[PDB]
Design a protein around this ligand. Structure first.
Ligand SMILES: Nc1nc2c(ncn2[C@@H]2O[C@H](COP(=O)(O)OP(=O)(O)NP(=O)(O)O)[C@@H](O)[C@H]2O)c(=O)[nH]1
Ligand SMILES: Nc1ncnc2c1ncn2[C@@H]1O[C@H](COP(=O)(O)OP(=O)(O)OP(=O)(O)O)[C@@H](O)[C@H]1O
Ligand SMILES: [Mg+2]
Ligand SMILES: [Mg+2]
Ligand SMILES: [Mg+2]
Lengths: 208, 80, 132, 352, 51, 101
C-alpha cells in the first residue's frame, strides 16, 4: 500500500458529523478530538455521501464486474432494478385491491430480502483430526453468509443453462424467485443444509 | 467552383436561389405582379437574412447565430 | 465584476485539475467549457462531482469552472473532486473543513500505477512457474 | 394533480399549461402513434397504464405557428434542435397530435436513420436501375401510414396510371388505399408504393383536397452518409436509395397546403460525434442548403418549474420507490445528477 | 477526388516547391527516395563501423 | 589484427559494399519503377545479380567492435552487452548509470 500505517480510513456519514456535542459521551468526545491529529485516506471513487447509496448493491455490482469494466457491471445492475420494478408494477395493476396490499414494488426491498433468503446458516469446514480432514458442520460468520448468498446468485445467472437470455432479465427473474423462497439459489442453500445435517456426527470436532 | 472557395459568398448561392424562389411563390399567392428581382433582394429584410447566413457559414456556429438566423427567416416568411 | 471566488488544484493518477469555485451561483459546473453532464456521461463520474457539495449541504449554491487534462475519465473526475473540495473550503466554517478532511475529501490519493519489473509478467504478476 | 391538466385538447393548450401533463387517450395512441414515440416513453405508457405528455414552450411555440399557417404560401420548414434527450421527439409528437385532431393528413417518418443503416435486403429497383429499394423498411412504414390516415385513404384518389407489373396496374381514379395495399401485400412494390404516396399527397395538397403535415424525426439522415454497401463492398450514397430520394422531395417548399416539421437527432446518426447538436453540425453543408430557409426551434433541459412537475408526476404514479426520493435532499441529488435533462432524469428514476 | 481547379493548383505548387510534377504511382516514387538519401553502404556508420 | 576471422570477413564485406554502392544504386533505380520497359528492366535484373556477392549490403553484420560478438550488440556504442556493462559498471561511459525507479 502507498498509504503508511498512520493513515486512517475516512468516515463518510453526514449524520455522524452534525450530531450535537451534548449528546456525545466522554469516549466519543475523545475519538473526535483524536481524529483531528490523524492522517485520513482519500475517499475512494466508489462510495459517496449520497442518500441513494446502498453498500450491498455496490458490493454485488463489484462481484459481477469482469476485467474492471465497472460501467458495464453498473449498467447491468440498474437494468435489473428497473426490470424487477416493472415486473412488480405489472403484477400490481393486474391484481385485486386485496392482493395489491401484499405486492412489493420497491426493488431495493426485494433485492435485500432475496439475498437474505439465500444466506446459509451453517457450512462445512475441513478440520484435521488424527491426520485426516473431515467436513465438520460449523457456524458461518456474517461476512461469509452474505458473501455466499451473492456468489451463488451470480454463479446461477452465468450458468450456460440460460440460452441467449440477457443478464438483466435472468437476474431479475432469479431475485423474484428467491424473494418468494423458490428457485435454484434457494435449492443450493438447502443442499448445504442437508449436507451439513448428514455430517452431524462430526460436529464435535470443532473446538470454538 | 463553390467547393474551392474558402469564404462563403451569398451571391449566386443556393441560399439566394432558394429565398428568391420562395418570395416569388408568396407574391403569386397574394396575386401581386411585382416580381422584380432587384426589388425583392433590395429590402432590409433580405440584408438581415444575407448577414445571418454568411455568419453561419464563415463563423463558428452557436446559439446566438442560430437565433439571429431564426428572426431573419421569420420576417421574410411572415411568420409572427 | 466583483464576484468572490476561490481557486485550487487537484491531482489523481496522471490527471491534473484546476477549479474556480464562486461564492454564489446556481450549481453550474463547466469542465473545459462544457456542461458537466455532457463532459461526464458516466453517472459514477458525476457522483464524484456531487460528493463535495452534498457533504456540506451546498448543492445548487455555487458555480464552478474547472479545467482538467491527462488521465482517463475516472481519474479526471477524481482530480476535479479534490480541486473543488479544496476551493470550497474557503466558503465553509472551520468545523466543516475538518469534517471534509475526516471524510477523505481533502487528501491527495497517492495510489499510482506501479512499474513493470524485468523477469516477470507485470508489476506483481510473475511468469508461470514451469511445470516440474 | 399539481402536475396534470384537465385540458386534453392540444388546440387549447397555452402558456398557462406549461409544465403540466395532459393525457393522450388510448384511442389516439393506437391511431395517431403506431410509431414515433421514444422506446423508453413507450415503456412508461405500459408501466403507468397511461400516456401523459408535459406541455412545454417548444411545442407551444410550434403550435402557435401551425395555428397561423397561411395555406396559400409554400410550406414552411420547422426544425427542432437541441442537446441529446431534451425532448425533441416528444415535442414533435405533441405537434403531430394537434394536426391529427385537426383532420390533417399525417406523413410521419418516426426515425429516418433506420433507412440508411442495417439493411439486409437491399434490392435493385426496377423503376430506376440506378436506385436501390428497401422492401422491409418501406412495407413497415406503409402499415403504420395506413393506421394513421385510414379514414382519408378512400376519399383520396390517384390522378394517374401506375404500372406495377405487366399484369397489375393502378388505374386513374382508384383510391390511394389501393396503392398502399399493393405495397403492403407485395413487398417488392413497397418502395415504389411509398414513392407514389409522397407524389400524390404533395400533388393533391396543393389543390386544396386536404392539409398535409410532413413530420420527419432524424431529418439529418437524408443528406449524410450511409453504412449500406454494394455487392462489391462499396459505399452507397443516400441519393441512390429510392426512399431517401423521394423523401427529399417532400422537404422542398415547392408545394402549399401544409407544413414541414422535422427534428434533428444525433442518437442513431452515422459519423457524428456525441456532442453534436446544432443544425449545421448535424445537417452538414448539403443538408443545410436543402432546408434553408427554415425556422429552427430550440429544445432545452427542464426549467425549475418543469423539473418539479416531472418529479410530482413520478411520485403521483408511485414510480419513485426509494424512501428518500420524495425528500428535498433526494430531489437535489436527482437535479444535480441529471442537470435537469429530461432523458437523464427518466433513466435515473427508472431504477429508484 | 479533386476538382480541376484544385488539381491545377496542386500541380502549380509542386513545380514551385520542386516536387514531382508528372503523375507517378507509389512504386515509381521509390526512385525519388533512392536518390534523395545516401545508400546504407555509404553511410559513415556502415563503412567505418569498426575501428 | 582483427578479433577473429569472422570480423575480418565482415570488414571486407563493408569495404566491397562501399565500393559498389553507387553502381548498385543506379542499377536498382532502373528496376524499382513501372515507367521503363520490361525488356530494359529484365536486363537490369541480370546486371545487379552478376555483381559480387559480398557487395550486397544485407550480408553485413553489426558485430561487437571489441569482441566480434554477432548478437546482443547495442548499436549506439557498437559494443556487446558484456563489454558495454564492463565499461559502464566501472564508470567509464560518460553519463551512463544504473537505473532505479
Ligand atoms: N412502380 C412504379 N413506381 C412509380 C410509378 N410512377 C412513379 N413511381 C414511383 O414514384 C416515385 C416518384 O414518382 P416520379 O416523381 O414520377 O419519379 P421520377 O420520374 O423518378 N422523378 P425524378 O426525375 O425526380 O427522379 C418514383 O421514383 C417511383 O418510385 C409507376 O408507374 N410505377
Ligand atoms: N414533453 C415531455 N413529456 C414527458 N416526458 C418528456 C417530455 N420531453 C421529454 N421527456 C422525457 O425525456 C425522454 C427523452 O425525450 P425524447 O426522446 O423526446 O428526447 P430527444 O431530445 O428527442 O432525444 P434524442 O436526442 O435521443 O433524439 C422521454 O423518454 C421522457 O422520459
Ligand atoms: Mg496483468
Ligand atoms: Mg429524439
Ligand atoms: Mg542481418
Amino acid at each position: 500500500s502507498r498509504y503508511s500505517p498512520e493513515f486512517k480510513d475516512p468516515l463518510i456519514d453526514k449524520e455522524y458529523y452534525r450530531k450535537p456535542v451534548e449528546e456525545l459521551t466522554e469516549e466519543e468526545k475523545y475519538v473526535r478530538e483524536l481524529k483531528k491529529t490523524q492522517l485520513i485516506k482519500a475517499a475512494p471513487a466508489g462510495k459517496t455521501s449520497s442518500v441513494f447509496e446502498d453498500p450491498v448493491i455496490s458490493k454485488f455490482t463489484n462481484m459481477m464486474m469482469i476485467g474492471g469494466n465497472k460501467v458495464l457491471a453498473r449498467s447491468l445492475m440498474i437494468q435489473t432494478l428497473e426490470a424487477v420494478k416493472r415486473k412488480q408494477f405489472e403484477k400490481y395493476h393486474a391484481a385485486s385491491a386485496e392482493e395489491q396490499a401484499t405486492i412489493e414494488r420497491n426493488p431495493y426491498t426485494i433485492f435485500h430480502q432475496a439475498l437474505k433468503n439465500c444466506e446459509p446458516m451453517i457450512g462445512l469446514v475441513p478440520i484435521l483430526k488424527g491426520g485426516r480432514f473431515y467436513q465438520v458442520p460449523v457456524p458461518l460468520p456474517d461476512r461469509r453468509r452474505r458473501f455466499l448468498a451473492m456468489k451463488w446468485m451470480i454463479t446461477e445467472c452465468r450458468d450456460k443453462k440460460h440460452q441467449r437470455t440477457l443478464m438483466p432479465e435472468k437476474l431479475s427473474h432469479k431475485l423474484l424467485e428467491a424473494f418468494h423462497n423458490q428457485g435454484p439459489v434457494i435449492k443450493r442453500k438447502h443442499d448445504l443444509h442437508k449436507m451439513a445435517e448428514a455430517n452431524r456426527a462430526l460436529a464435535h470436532y470443532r473446538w470454538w | 467552383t463553390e467547393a474551392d472557395m474558402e469564404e462563403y459568398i451569398w451571391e449566386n448561392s443556393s441560399s439566394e436561389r432558394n429565398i428568391l424562389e420562395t418570395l416569388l411563390q408568396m407574391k403569386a399567392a397574394e396575386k401581386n405582379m411585382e416580381i422584380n428581382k432587384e426589388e425583392l433582394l433590395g429590402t432590409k429584410e433580405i440584408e438581415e437574412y444575407k448577414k445571418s447566413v454568411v455568419s453561419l457559414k464563415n463563423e463558428e456556429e452557436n446559439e446566438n447565430s442560430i437565433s439571429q438566423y431564426k428572426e431573419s427567416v421569420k420576417r421574410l416568411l411572415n411568420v409572427t | 465584476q466583483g464576484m468572490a471566488f476561490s481557486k485550487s488544484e487537484g491531482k489523481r493518477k496522471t490527471a491534473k485539475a484546476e477549479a474556480i469555485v464562486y461564492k454564489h451561483g446556481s450549481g453550474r459546473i463547466k469542465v473545459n467549457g462544457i456542461d458537466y453532464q455532457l463532459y461526464f456521461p458516466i453517472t459514477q463520474d458525476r457522483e464524484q462531482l456531487m460528493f463535495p457539495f452534498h457533504f456540506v449541504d451546498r448543492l445548487g449554491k455555487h458555480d464552478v469552472t474547472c479545467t482538467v487534462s491527462g488521465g482517463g475519465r475516472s481519474a479526471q473526475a477524481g482530480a476535479i473532486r479534490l480541486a473543488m473540495a479544496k476551493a470550497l473550503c474557503s466558503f465553509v466554517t472551520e468545523d466543516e473543513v475538518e469534517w471534509m478532511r475526516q471524510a477523505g475529501l481533502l487528501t491527495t490519493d497517492p495510489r499510482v500505477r506501479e512499474r513493470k519489473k524485468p523477469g516477470q509478467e507485470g508489476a506483481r504478476r510473475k511468469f508461470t512457474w514451469k511445470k516440474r | 394533480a399539481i402536475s396534470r391538466t384537465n385540458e386534453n385538447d392540444p388546440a387549447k393548450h397555452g402558456d398557462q399549461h406549461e409544465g403540466q401533463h395532459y393525457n393522450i387517450s388510448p384511442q389516439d395512441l393506437e391511431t395517431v402513434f403506431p410509431h414515433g414515440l421514444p422506446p423508453r416513453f413507450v415503456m412508461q405508457v405500459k408501466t403507468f397504464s397511461e400516456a401523459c405528455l408535459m406541455v412545454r414552450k417548444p411545442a407551444l411555440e410550434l403550435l402557435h405557428y401551425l395555428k397561423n399557417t397561411s395555406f396559400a404560401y409554400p410550406a414552411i420548414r420547422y426544425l427542432l434542435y437541441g442537446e441529446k434527450g431534451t425532448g425533441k421527439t416528444l415535442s414533435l409528437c405533441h405537434v403531430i397530435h394537434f394536426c391529427a385532431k385537426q383532420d390533417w393528413l399525417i406523413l410521419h417518418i418516426p426515425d429516418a436513420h433506420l433507412w440508411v443503416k442495417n439493411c439486409r435486403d437491399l434490392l435493385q429497383s426496377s423503376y430506376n436501375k440506378q436506385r436501390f429499394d428497401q422492401p422491409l423498411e418501406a412495407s413497415t412504414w406503409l402499415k403504420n401510414f395506413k393506421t394513421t390516415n385510414e379514414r382519408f385513404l378512400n376519399q383520396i384518389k390517384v390522378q394517374e396510371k401506375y404500372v406495377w407489373n405487366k399484369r397489375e396496374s393502378t388505374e386513374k381514379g382508384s383510391p390511394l388505399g389501393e396503392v398502399v395495399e399493393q405495397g403492403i401485400t407485395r413487398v417488392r412494390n413497397a418502395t415504389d408504393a411509398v414513392g407514389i404516396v409522397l407524389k400524390e399527397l404533395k400533388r393533391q395538397s396543393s389543390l386544396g383536397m386536404f392539409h398535409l403535415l410532413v413530420a420527419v424525426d432524424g431529418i439529418n439522415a437524408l443528406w449524410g452518409r450511409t453504412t449500406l454497401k454494394r455487392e462489391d463492398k462499396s459505399p452507397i450514397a443516400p441519393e441512390e436509395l429510392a426512399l431517401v430520394h423521394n423523401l427529399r422531395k417532400m422537404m422542398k417548399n415547392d408545394w402549399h397546403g401544409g407544413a414541414i416539421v422535422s427534428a434533428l437527432s444525433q442518437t442513431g446518426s452515422l459519423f457524428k460525434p456525441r456532442k453534436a447538436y446544432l443544425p449545421q453540425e448535424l445537417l452538414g453543408k448539403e443538408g443545410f442548403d436543402a432546408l434553408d430557409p427554415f425556422i429552427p426551434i430550440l429544445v432545452s433541459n427542464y426549467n425549475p418549474k418543469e423539473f418539479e412537475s416531472c418529479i410530482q408526476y413520478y411520485l403521483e404514479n408511485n414510480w419513485l420507490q426509494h424512501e428518500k426520493a420524495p425528500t428535498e435532499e433526494g430531489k437535489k441529488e436527482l437535479l444535480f445528477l441529471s442537470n435537469a435533462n429530461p432523458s437523464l432524469l427518466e433513466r435515473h428514476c427508472a431504477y429508484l | 477526388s479533386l476538382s480541376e481547379y484544385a488539381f491545377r493548383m496542386s500541380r502549380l505548387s509542386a513545380r514551385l516547391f520542386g516536387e514531382v510534377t508528372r503523375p507517378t504511382n507509389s512504386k515509381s516514387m521509390k526512385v525519388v527516395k533512392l536518390f534523395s538519401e545516401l545508400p546504407l553502404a555509404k553511410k559513415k556508420e556502415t563503412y567505418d563501423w569498426y575501428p | 589484427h582483427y578479433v577473429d576471422w569472422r570480423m575480418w570477413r565482415d570488414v571486407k564485406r563493408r569495404k566491397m559494399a562501399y565500393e559498389y554502392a553507387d553502381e548498385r544504386l543506379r542499377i536498382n533505380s532502373l528496376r524499382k519503377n513501372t515507367i521503363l520497359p520490361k525488356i530494359l528492366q529484365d536486363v537490369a535484373d541480370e546486371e545487379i545479380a552478376a555483381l559480387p556477392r559480398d557487395s550486397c549490403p544485407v550480408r553485413i553484420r553489426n558485430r561487437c567492435v571489441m569482441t566480434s560478438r554477432p548478437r546482443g550488440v547495442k548499436r549506439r556504442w557498437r559494443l556487446s552487452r558484456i563489454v558495454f556493462r564492463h565499461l559502464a559498471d566501472h564508470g567509464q561511459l560518460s553519463g551512463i548509470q544504473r537505473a532505479t525507479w
